[PDB]
Design a protein around this ligand. Structure first.
Ligand SMILES: [K+]
Ligand SMILES: [Mg+2]
Ligand SMILES: [Mg+2]
Ligand SMILES: [Mg+2]
Ligand SMILES: [Mg+2]
Ligand SMILES: [Mg+2]
Ligand SMILES: [Mg+2]
Ligand SMILES: [Mg+2]
Ligand SMILES: [Mg+2]
Ligand SMILES: [Mg+2]
Ligand SMILES: [Mg+2]
Ligand SMILES: [Mg+2]
Ligand SMILES: [Mg+2]
Ligand SMILES: [Mg+2]
Ligand SMILES: [Mg+2]
Ligand SMILES: [Mg+2]
Ligand SMILES: [Mg+2]
Ligand SMILES: [Mg+2]
Ligand SMILES: [Mg+2]
Ligand SMILES: [Mg+2]
Ligand SMILES: [Mg+2]
Ligand SMILES: [Mg+2]
Ligand SMILES: [Mg+2]
Ligand SMILES: [Mg+2]
Ligand SMILES: [Mg+2]
Ligand SMILES: [Mg+2]
Ligand SMILES: [Mg+2]
Ligand SMILES: [Mg+2]
Ligand SMILES: [Mg+2]
Ligand SMILES: [Mg+2]
Ligand SMILES: [Mg+2]
Ligand SMILES: [Mg+2]
Ligand SMILES: [Mg+2]
Ligand SMILES: [Mg+2]
Ligand SMILES: [Mg+2]
Ligand SMILES: [Mg+2]
Ligand SMILES: [Mg+2]
Ligand SMILES: [Mg+2]
Ligand SMILES: [Mg+2]
Ligand SMILES: [Mg+2]
Ligand SMILES: [Mg+2]
Ligand SMILES: [Mg+2]
Ligand SMILES: [Mg+2]
Ligand SMILES: [Mg+2]
Ligand SMILES: [Mg+2]
Ligand SMILES: [Mg+2]
Ligand SMILES: [Mg+2]
Ligand SMILES: [Mg+2]
Ligand SMILES: [Mg+2]
Ligand SMILES: [Mg+2]
Ligand SMILES: [Mg+2]
Ligand SMILES: [Mg+2]
Ligand SMILES: [Mg+2]
Ligand SMILES: [Mg+2]
Ligand SMILES: [Mg+2]
Ligand SMILES: [Mg+2]
Ligand SMILES: [Mg+2]
Ligand SMILES: [Mg+2]
Ligand SMILES: [Mg+2]
Ligand SMILES: [Mg+2]
Ligand SMILES: [Mg+2]
Ligand SMILES: [Mg+2]
Ligand SMILES: [Mg+2]
Ligand SMILES: [Mg+2]
Ligand SMILES: [Mg+2]
Ligand SMILES: [Mg+2]
Ligand SMILES: [Mg+2]
Ligand SMILES: [Mg+2]
Ligand SMILES: [Mg+2]
Ligand SMILES: [Mg+2]
Ligand SMILES: [Mg+2]
Ligand SMILES: [Mg+2]
Ligand SMILES: [Mg+2]
Ligand SMILES: [Mg+2]
Ligand SMILES: [Mg+2]
Ligand SMILES: [Mg+2]
Ligand SMILES: [Mg+2]
Ligand SMILES: [Mg+2]
Ligand SMILES: [Mg+2]
Ligand SMILES: [Mg+2]
Ligand SMILES: [Mg+2]
Ligand SMILES: [Mg+2]
Ligand SMILES: [Mg+2]
Ligand SMILES: [Mg+2]
Ligand SMILES: [Mg+2]
Ligand SMILES: [Mg+2]
Ligand SMILES: [Mg+2]
Ligand SMILES: [Mg+2]
Ligand SMILES: [Mg+2]
Ligand SMILES: [Mg+2]
Ligand SMILES: [Mg+2]
Ligand SMILES: [Mg+2]
Ligand SMILES: [Mg+2]
Ligand SMILES: [Mg+2]
Ligand SMILES: [Mg+2]
Ligand SMILES: [Mg+2]
Ligand SMILES: [Mg+2]
Ligand SMILES: [Mg+2]
Ligand SMILES: [Mg+2]
Ligand SMILES: [Mg+2]
Ligand SMILES: [Mg+2]
Ligand SMILES: [Mg+2]
Ligand SMILES: [Mg+2]
Ligand SMILES: [Mg+2]
Ligand SMILES: [Mg+2]
Ligand SMILES: [Mg+2]
Ligand SMILES: [Mg+2]
Ligand SMILES: [Mg+2]
Ligand SMILES: [Mg+2]
Lengths: 65, 151, 116
RNA sequence: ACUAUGCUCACG
RNA sequence: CGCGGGGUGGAGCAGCCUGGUAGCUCGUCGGGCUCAUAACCCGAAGAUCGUCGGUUCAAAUCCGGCCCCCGCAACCA
RNA sequence: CGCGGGGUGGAGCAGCCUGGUAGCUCGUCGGGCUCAUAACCCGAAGAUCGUCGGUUCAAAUCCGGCCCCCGCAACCA
RNA sequence: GCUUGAGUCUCGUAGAGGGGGGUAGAAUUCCAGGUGUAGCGGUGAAAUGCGUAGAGAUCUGGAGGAAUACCGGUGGCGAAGGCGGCCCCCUGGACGAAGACUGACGCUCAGGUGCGAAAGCGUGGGGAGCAAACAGGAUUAGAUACCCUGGUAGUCCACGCCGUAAACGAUGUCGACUUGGAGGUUGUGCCCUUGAGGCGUGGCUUCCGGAGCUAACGCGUUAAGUCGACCGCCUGGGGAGUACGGCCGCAAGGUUAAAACUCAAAUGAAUUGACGGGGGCCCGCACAAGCGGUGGAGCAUGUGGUUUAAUUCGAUGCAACGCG
RNA sequence: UUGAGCCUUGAUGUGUAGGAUAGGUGGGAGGCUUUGAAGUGUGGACGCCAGUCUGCAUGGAGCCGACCUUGAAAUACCACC
């Protein structure tokens, strides 16, 4: 998070923030995640992941493109 | 047109001032397809303008049209849901055409006597920017400057 | 009068506002501005440019103190901050370092209920 | 952003 | 009984002690906006200082009245 | 019977106790919008003020009677 | 008798299993204190609310409560309910390794009894945040809602009660048996640890699929396959998991559990359409970008209406109304 | 840490005419300069950013009052505010 970038540079470049937190504090602990809803919304985000990964093996179809 | 990107028709130069800028000005000034009446008014106006201003016609019309020319105009776009005022850089073809229409629109009102007199006075007031046409650009700027927040 | 060398530009960027507040080294307020204080009200107040102009308005009104270089301390999310720091360069400062003070609670207090 | 309703029965 | 402050467009305000340049916010009509409505934004229409008098280069402004507006706390036929 | 207060477009309220001025919100009629109805938008009409008399230059508004209407009182034995 | 089921010991392995006690850091609210100058807050847009008594922001020092970021996963443990900071205390089970021992000690279970989320209930603590009820501002025809600002019971704790949930894999428990692949997780063997490996074989687990089954959807060695043991339950939809009595509860209510009456259906899965303020991709004066109009006037025409002895008849959203 | 008065002293105070970031009024025409000067290097005090004000010195002893623009004349000396 603590980013100095030497001296001649300036131009922000603080992906250190964007690839660490921000979303963790904000879109999660902004408004209440009703205990069960995480368990629901994760398990569908988890089931959607393996749906794509299992399809990615069977994606090699005829195509003809 | 939805996905029909086609170009525009070519226009013709005006005999006595062989050009293009004021040739379109005649078309915007025209009503009921009477180009003979309209073209006689534009020559009458620019000849009376050139006498007073002490310049030519093309350069007298230019130092007048640029003073009523919009830099940025205000559209409104609903990207997400809500309706807010998004300013946008006007295209160079529409830029001068939007100015010509404001000169003629102001000249409909302001009933002096003749159409040739009214345009001459509007273009004279445009040269020293104090007409109704410059006011209509001035307000168009104020919307873009005030609502500059929106990209 | 005082004439501080360096300071700290605290930026409180919420969704609705962007409150810029330039302080000294020891967290002592010298001046401030807001998106609401700049003009820009309602829908206009929550934008990157309305934060830019607020930082430009906070850049001046601390010229008596004469800060050459400062540290940024962004906070919250907001439409500003990735825009507000651009404003501090263009105004007339040197950014020593940029930091976050976005208060991450380690699952502590129950937040408000979801809205519909 | 929000934004109601559709009187009864009738296609062997 | 007083000494004191206070007096502007329809109205609530300041500005009024530091004489040469009457602001500012609701009532005001036209826009731009959008298939539209709300909003939001831009510019317009109105007091030469409640009113009358002295001086001095210039007076809402310095000084005297009025119509008053009161703040009050005094008020024992 | 005493005592205040009332009675105003179709409804409920201002304007009434300071004499010349009739508003507000719904509803009604007309036109829009919609496939149509509602909602919504834009126009329009609609009350001589309980009634009968005064006073007055002029009365919804002042005064008197009479007809409904509320509120208060009809107590000590 | 026997030893294969079942149990014991032996040495370990993993784990938010449990119960009791500590302590840590971030943050929220608040408390006094410094700085400092108009807003903050919020929203689709506003307002209530909070602020010139000096808020918000910023920093200093406290106080208190509750919950434990990241690790963290189609990870683990638990009979289910459920169980996440770190540390000790007591403590239940699970699995593996190879033996030794017991010698059918087993499996199910009506009544019985225990445990059993959240919300409730009782007595006594605590009370930051959140938040039923409630209040105010919006929204709207109305808004006893959704949105906003406040906000009490409650959520926390100790101890008793309650005994229910879509308490759900909507799938009772135990056991045997029948093609596969990719993984996750925790063991334990064989080998060179010769270098993040080579090769088996036990637990538990997620995903896809074969035969077979199924009304179909799907299930599929963790079966909804093939069989056995025992239990629970079902018999059309409404009436109704209601009434009445019994039992249980402080109550809230739970549990057991009908009948009259009424209907010819109610229902499940899947199919084709149509529709969606579902998604994606396209189109047309659909919109944008323009331009001229109608709506205002007069007149012409055509309908509606109304009038009349008759104002013949037909056409009436778009697709009837200078139409037949 | 105060809440003001108050004297010494020093500036400060740009409608417009305009060489002047001049408030009213006045003793009245030489002050001052070698009691080490004009111009400036540089930096401070002030600033309605027009241009005031001044530490010290390389420099070296000059600078200038009526005149012309004003409702007013020059902080050249100096009295009172
Ligand atoms: K419970
Ligand atoms: Mg859960
Ligand atoms: Mg086309
Ligand atoms: Mg209805
Ligand atoms: Mg129906
Ligand atoms: Mg129907
Ligand atoms: Mg006083
Ligand atoms: Mg259209
Ligand atoms: Mg008396
Ligand atoms: Mg009326
Ligand atoms: Mg109507
Ligand atoms: Mg009547
Ligand atoms: Mg008379
Ligand atoms: Mg009258
Ligand atoms: Mg044996
Ligand atoms: Mg066993
Ligand atoms: Mg080991
Ligand atoms: Mg453990
Ligand atoms: Mg343990
Ligand atoms: Mg444990
Ligand atoms: Mg424990
Ligand atoms: Mg405990
Ligand atoms: Mg702490
Ligand atoms: Mg703390
Ligand atoms: Mg104190
Ligand atoms: Mg305090
Ligand atoms: Mg307000
Ligand atoms: Mg308020
Ligand atoms: Mg205030
Ligand atoms: Mg207060
Ligand atoms: Mg204070
Ligand atoms: Mg404070
Ligand atoms: Mg604070
Ligand atoms: Mg603290
Ligand atoms: Mg503590
Ligand atoms: Mg397990
Ligand atoms: Mg189980
Ligand atoms: Mg213990
Ligand atoms: Mg067990
Ligand atoms: Mg055991
Ligand atoms: Mg063994
Ligand atoms: Mg035996
Ligand atoms: Mg034996
Ligand atoms: Mg049993
Ligand atoms: Mg039983
Ligand atoms: Mg129990
Ligand atoms: Mg329990
Ligand atoms: Mg219990
Ligand atoms: Mg509970
Ligand atoms: Mg309790
Ligand atoms: Mg009680
Ligand atoms: Mg008690
Ligand atoms: Mg509390
Ligand atoms: Mg709350
Ligand atoms: Mg709430
Ligand atoms: Mg309520
Ligand atoms: Mg209130
Ligand atoms: Mg409410
Ligand atoms: Mg309401
Ligand atoms: Mg709150
Ligand atoms: Mg706890
Ligand atoms: Mg405890
Ligand atoms: Mg305990
Ligand atoms: Mg019990
Ligand atoms: Mg039970
Ligand atoms: Mg049940
Ligand atoms: Mg469950
Ligand atoms: Mg589940
Ligand atoms: Mg499964
Ligand atoms: Mg069940
Ligand atoms: Mg059992
Ligand atoms: Mg085993
Ligand atoms: Mg199959
Ligand atoms: Mg079968
Ligand atoms: Mg099949
Ligand atoms: Mg299965
Ligand atoms: Mg098998
Ligand atoms: Mg097998
Ligand atoms: Mg097995
Ligand atoms: Mg089995
Ligand atoms: Mg089976
Ligand atoms: Mg079956
Ligand atoms: Mg039966
Ligand atoms: Mg039945
Ligand atoms: Mg039946
Ligand atoms: Mg019952
Ligand atoms: Mg009993
Ligand atoms: Mg009992
Ligand atoms: Mg109870
Ligand atoms: Mg039963
Ligand atoms: Mg029926
Ligand atoms: Mg069913
Ligand atoms: Mg179905
Ligand atoms: Mg659709
Ligand atoms: Mg669609
Ligand atoms: Mg076409
Ligand atoms: Mg269009
Ligand atoms: Mg047009
Ligand atoms: Mg038109
Ligand atoms: Mg019409
Ligand atoms: Mg017409
Ligand atoms: Mg008409
Ligand atoms: Mg004719
Ligand atoms: Mg007819
Ligand atoms: Mg007749
Ligand atoms: Mg006809
Ligand atoms: Mg007909
Ligand atoms: Mg017909
Ligand atoms: Mg037809």
């Amino acid at each position: 998070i603590k980013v100095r970038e030497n001296e001649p540079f300036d131009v922000a470049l603080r992906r250190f923030k964007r690839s660490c937190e921000k979303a963790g504090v904000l879109a999660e602990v902004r408004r209440r995640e009703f205990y069960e809803k995480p368990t629901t919304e994760r398990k569908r985000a988890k089931a959607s992941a393996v749906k794509r990964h299992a399809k990615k093996l069977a994606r090699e179809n005829a195509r003809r493109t | 047109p939805r996905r029909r990107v086609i170009g525009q028709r070519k226009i013709l130069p005006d005999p006595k001032f062989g050009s293009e800028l004021l040739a379109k000005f005649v078309n915007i000034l025209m009503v009921d397809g009477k180009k003979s009446t309209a073209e006689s008014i534009v020559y009458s106006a620019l000849e009376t303008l050139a006498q007073r201003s002490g310049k030519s016609e093309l350069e007298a019309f230019e130092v007048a049209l640029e003073n009523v020319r919009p830099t940025v105009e205000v559209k409104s776009r609903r990207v997400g849901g809500s309706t807010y005022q998004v300013p946008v850089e006007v295209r160079p073809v529409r830029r001068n055409a939007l100015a010509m229409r404001w000169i003629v629109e102001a000249a409909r009102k302001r009933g002096d006597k003749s159409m040739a007199l009214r345009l001459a006075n509007e273009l004279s007031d445009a040269a020293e920017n104090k007409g109704t046409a410059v006011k209509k650009r001035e307000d168009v700027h104020r919307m873009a400057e005030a609502n500059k927040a929106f990209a | 009068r005082k004439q501080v060398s360096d300071g700290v530009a605290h930026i409180h960027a919420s969704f609705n506002n962007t409150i810029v507040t330039i302080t000294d080294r020891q967290g002592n307020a010298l001046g401030w501005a807001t998106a609401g204080g700049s003009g820009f009200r309602g829908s206009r107040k929550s934008t990157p440019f309305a934060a830019q102009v607020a930082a430009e308005r906070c850049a001046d009104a601390v010229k008596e103190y004469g800060i050459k270089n400062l540290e940024v301390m962004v906070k919250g999310p907001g439409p500003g901050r990735e825009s507000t720091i651009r404003a501090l360069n263009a105004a007339g400062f040197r950014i020593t370092n940029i930091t976050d003070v976005t208060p991450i609670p380690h699952n502590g207090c129950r937040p408000p209920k979801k809205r519909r």
